Design an enzyme around this catalytic site. Sequence first.
Site, PDB file in Angstrom:
ATOM      1  N   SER A 293       0.862  -1.174   0.000  1.00 25.15           N
ATOM      2  CA  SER A 293       0.000   0.000   0.000  1.00 25.15           C
ATOM      3  C   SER A 293       0.901   1.227   0.000  1.00 25.15           C
ATOM      4  O   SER A 293       2.082   1.147   0.353  1.00 25.15           O
ATOM      5  CB  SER A 293      -0.952   0.016   1.209  1.00 25.15           C
ATOM      6  OG  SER A 293      -1.755   1.192   1.251  1.00 25.15           O
ATOM      7  N   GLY A 294       0.340   2.360  -0.423  1.00 29.86           N
ATOM      8  CA  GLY A 294       1.083   3.605  -0.368  1.00 29.86           C
ATOM      9  C   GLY A 294       0.749   4.619  -1.442  1.00 29.86           C
ATOM     10  O   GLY A 294      -0.408   5.029  -1.596  1.00 29.86           O
ATOM     11  N   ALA A 295       1.778   5.046  -2.178  1.00 38.70           N
ATOM     12  CA  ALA A 295       1.591   6.029  -3.240  1.00 38.70           C
ATOM     13  C   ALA A 295       0.552   5.546  -4.245  1.00 38.70           C
ATOM     14  O   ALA A 295      -0.475   6.202  -4.462  1.00 38.70           O
ATOM     15  CB  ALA A 295       2.931   6.322  -3.920  1.00 38.70           C
ATOM     16  N   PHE A 296       0.803   4.387  -4.864  1.00 41.56           N
ATOM     17  CA  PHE A 296      -0.202   3.761  -5.721  1.00 41.56           C
ATOM     18  C   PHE A 296      -1.562   3.723  -5.037  1.00 41.56           C
ATOM     19  O   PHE A 296      -2.596   3.914  -5.684  1.00 41.56           O
ATOM     20  CB  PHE A 296       0.239   2.346  -6.098  1.00 41.56           C
ATOM     21  CG  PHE A 296       0.766   1.550  -4.939  1.00 41.56           C
ATOM     22  CD1 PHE A 296       2.110   1.616  -4.593  1.00 41.56           C
ATOM     23  CD2 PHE A 296      -0.081   0.746  -4.188  1.00 41.56           C
ATOM     24  CE1 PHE A 296       2.601   0.889  -3.525  1.00 41.56           C
ATOM     25  CE2 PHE A 296       0.400   0.013  -3.119  1.00 41.56           C
ATOM     26  CZ  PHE A 296       1.743   0.084  -2.787  1.00 41.56           C
ATOM     27  N   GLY A 297      -1.577   3.486  -3.729  1.00 44.27           N
ATOM     28  CA  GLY A 297      -2.813   3.431  -2.980  1.00 44.27           C
ATOM     29  C   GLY A 297      -2.922   2.148  -2.194  1.00 44.27           C
ATOM     30  O   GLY A 297      -2.481   2.076  -1.044  1.00 44.27           O
ATOM     31  N   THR A 298      -3.512   1.129  -2.810  1.00 44.63           N
ATOM     32  CA  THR A 298      -3.627  -0.186  -2.197  1.00 44.63           C
ATOM     33  C   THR A 298      -3.792  -1.214  -3.306  1.00 44.63           C
ATOM     34  O   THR A 298      -4.676  -1.071  -4.159  1.00 44.63           O
ATOM     35  CB  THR A 298      -4.814  -0.265  -1.225  1.00 44.63           C
ATOM     36  OG1 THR A 298      -6.023   0.004  -1.935  1.00 44.63           O
ATOM     37  CG2 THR A 298      -4.676   0.751  -0.105  1.00 44.63           C
TER      38      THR A 298
ATOM     39  N   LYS B 216      -6.037  -3.086  -7.983  1.00 43.74           N
ATOM     40  CA  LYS B 216      -5.451  -1.825  -7.546  1.00 43.74           C
ATOM     41  C   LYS B 216      -6.504  -0.728  -7.454  1.00 43.74           C
ATOM     42  O   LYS B 216      -7.458  -0.695  -8.237  1.00 43.74           O
ATOM     43  CB  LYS B 216      -4.341  -1.349  -8.491  1.00 43.74           C
ATOM     44  CG  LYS B 216      -3.725  -0.011  -8.056  1.00 43.74           C
ATOM     45  CD  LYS B 216      -2.896   0.630  -9.157  1.00 43.74           C
ATOM     46  CE  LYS B 216      -1.758  -0.282  -9.592  1.00 43.74           C
ATOM     47  NZ  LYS B 216      -1.224   0.034 -10.955  1.00 43.74           N
TER      48      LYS B 216
ATOM     49  N   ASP C 293       9.567   5.121 -16.674  1.00 46.17           N
ATOM     50  CA  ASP C 293       9.801   4.751 -15.290  1.00 46.17           C
ATOM     51  C   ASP C 293      10.287   3.314 -15.199  1.00 46.17           C
ATOM     52  O   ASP C 293       9.844   2.548 -14.333  1.00 46.17           O
ATOM     53  CB  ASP C 293       8.544   4.957 -14.460  1.00 46.17           C
ATOM     54  CG  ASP C 293       8.802   4.849 -12.975  1.00 46.17           C
ATOM     55  OD1 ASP C 293       9.975   4.958 -12.558  1.00 46.17           O
ATOM     56  OD2 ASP C 293       7.837   4.643 -12.215  1.00 46.17           O
TER      57      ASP C 293
ATOM     58  N   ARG D 270      12.263  -1.799  -9.529  1.00 46.58           N
ATOM     59  CA  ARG D 270      11.015  -1.846  -8.770  1.00 46.58           C
ATOM     60  C   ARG D 270       9.848  -2.244  -9.659  1.00 46.58           C
ATOM     61  O   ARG D 270       9.042  -3.096  -9.275  1.00 46.58           O
ATOM     62  CB  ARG D 270      10.737  -0.510  -8.069  1.00 46.58           C
ATOM     63  CG  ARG D 270      10.925   0.724  -8.905  1.00 46.58           C
ATOM     64  CD  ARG D 270      10.573   2.008  -8.131  1.00 46.58           C
ATOM     65  NE  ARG D 270      10.448   3.117  -9.067  1.00 46.58           N
ATOM     66  CZ  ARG D 270      11.454   3.875  -9.489  1.00 46.58           C
ATOM     67  NH1 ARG D 270      12.655   3.796  -8.950  1.00 46.58           N
ATOM     68  NH2 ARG D 270      11.251   4.732 -10.485  1.00 46.58           N
ATOM     69  N   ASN D 271       9.782  -1.694 -10.879  1.00 48.10           N
ATOM     70  CA  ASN D 271       8.644  -1.829 -11.792  1.00 48.10           C
ATOM     71  C   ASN D 271       8.712  -3.055 -12.702  1.00 48.10           C
ATOM     72  O   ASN D 271       8.137  -3.033 -13.798  1.00 48.10           O
ATOM     73  CB  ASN D 271       8.515  -0.568 -12.638  1.00 48.10           C
ATOM     74  CG  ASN D 271       8.079   0.596 -11.818  1.00 48.10           C
ATOM     75  OD1 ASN D 271       7.282   0.425 -10.896  1.00 48.10           O
ATOM     76  ND2 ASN D 271       8.608   1.787 -12.115  1.00 48.10           N
TER      77      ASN D 271
ATOM     78  N   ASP E 255       3.677  -0.993 -14.093  1.00 50.17           N
ATOM     79  CA  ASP E 255       3.546   0.411 -13.711  1.00 50.17           C
ATOM     80  C   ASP E 255       3.659   1.338 -14.905  1.00 50.17           C
ATOM     81  O   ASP E 255       4.751   1.829 -15.210  1.00 50.17           O
ATOM     82  CB  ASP E 255       4.592   0.792 -12.678  1.00 50.17           C
ATOM     83  CG  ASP E 255       4.179   1.989 -11.871  1.00 50.17           C
ATOM     84  OD1 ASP E 255       4.124   3.111 -12.435  1.00 50.17           O
ATOM     85  OD2 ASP E 255       3.871   1.795 -10.672  1.00 50.17           O
TER      86      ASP E 255
END
Length: 301
Positions: free
Chosen positions: A24-29, A49, A141, A145-146, A159
Site C-alpha cells: 500500500s502507499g503512493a499507488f494506494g492499495t 489496484k 519509469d 522496482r517496476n 507500472d
Amino acid sequence: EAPNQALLRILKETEFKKIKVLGSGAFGTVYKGLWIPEGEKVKIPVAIKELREATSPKANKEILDEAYVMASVDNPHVCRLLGICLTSTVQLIMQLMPFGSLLDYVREHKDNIGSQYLLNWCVQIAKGMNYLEDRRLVHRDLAARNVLVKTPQHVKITDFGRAKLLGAEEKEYHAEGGKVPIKWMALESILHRIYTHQSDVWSYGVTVWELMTFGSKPYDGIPASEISSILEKGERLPQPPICTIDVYMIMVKCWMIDADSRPKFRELIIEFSKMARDPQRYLVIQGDDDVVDADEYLIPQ
Ligand SMILES: COc1cc(N2CCC(N3CCN(C)CC3)CC2)c(NC(=O)C(Cl)Cl)cc1Nc1ncc(Cl)c(Nc2ccccc2P(C)(C)=O)n1
C-alpha cells in the site's frame, strides 16, 4: 495514426473476491485477489489496484489513463491489464505476479543463480521494452522496482502511470513538472524533460546495474539534486563486482551522453542473448483446483 482497436473490458464487482493486501502507499492499495468469470468454470488470480480512497477526480484521470495504455499492450514481458471495475473507486484488475518485485526478489534471494537467472532477466526486459518501442510507447519509469516476477524464469514490465504513447511524428515527450525518479533518468531528461526511447535505454542501464548489484541503491547517499552535475562531470555508477568488463561495458554504453550512440533494445536482446548461452564467462558469482493463470485465459470477448 493507426486506430487503437483495443477492447476495454468492464468487470462486474461481484465476479472477483479480494483476499489480502499486497503493499500500500503512493499507488494506494493493491489487493491480491481472485476473479471468477461467471459461468466460465475458471478461477483467475489477480492483483486489484485502487489509488488510496479519496475522490480526487483528477486521480481517476490518471487511473483511466494507465488503463488505456495497458489495454493497448500485449507482450509476454509486459503486464496484462485484465479489465476494470466501475465501482465508486475505479479498480484495475491485473494479473497476479506471485513472486513480487524483481528488486525485492534479488534482495530477498541474493542466493540468485548467476547469469542464467540474471542474464536471462536482462534478455526478457529488453524484449519487453523493444515491444513498447514498436508500439511507439515510452515507459519513463523503468526500474528494478517496476518489473514483476511471475516465476523466477519469467518477468514482466509494470507500472504505466508515467507511460506516454508518441504520436506518429513525436520523437520526444516534453513533460511538465512533478516528482521524477531522478536517479534512473537520462541526463537529457533530467535537464530538458526530453523523454525518448533512447532515454528508456538509460533507465534500462540503471535497472541492469540494480540486478547485477543484487539490489543496491543507485548513487546511494548522493542527493538527487547533485545527480545532474555528477553525471555531467563524467561520473557513472560503478562496475558491479560480479560483472566482467563485457557486461559492465554494455551498461556504460546505455549511459553515454549522445543518446544516439547508446544501444537499441533490439541489440541489447542480441548481446545478452549471446552472453546467456555461456553465463559464467560474463558473470562471476561464488556458487553457480480450477485455477487458470491469466496467460492462458485468453479473450472471452
Ligand atoms: C502476490 O504476489 C505478490 C507478493 C508481494 N509480496 C512481496 C514479498 C513476497 N514474498 C513472497 C514471494 N517471493 C518469494 C518473494 C517474497 C510476498 C508479498 C508483492 N509485493 C512486493 O513485491 C512489494 Cl511492492 Cl511490497 C506483490 C505480489 N504480486 C503482484 N502482482 C501484480 C501486481 Cl500489479 C502487483 N503490484 C503491486 C503489489 C504490491 C505493491 C505495489 C504494486 P505496483 C501496482 C507499484 O506494481 N503485485
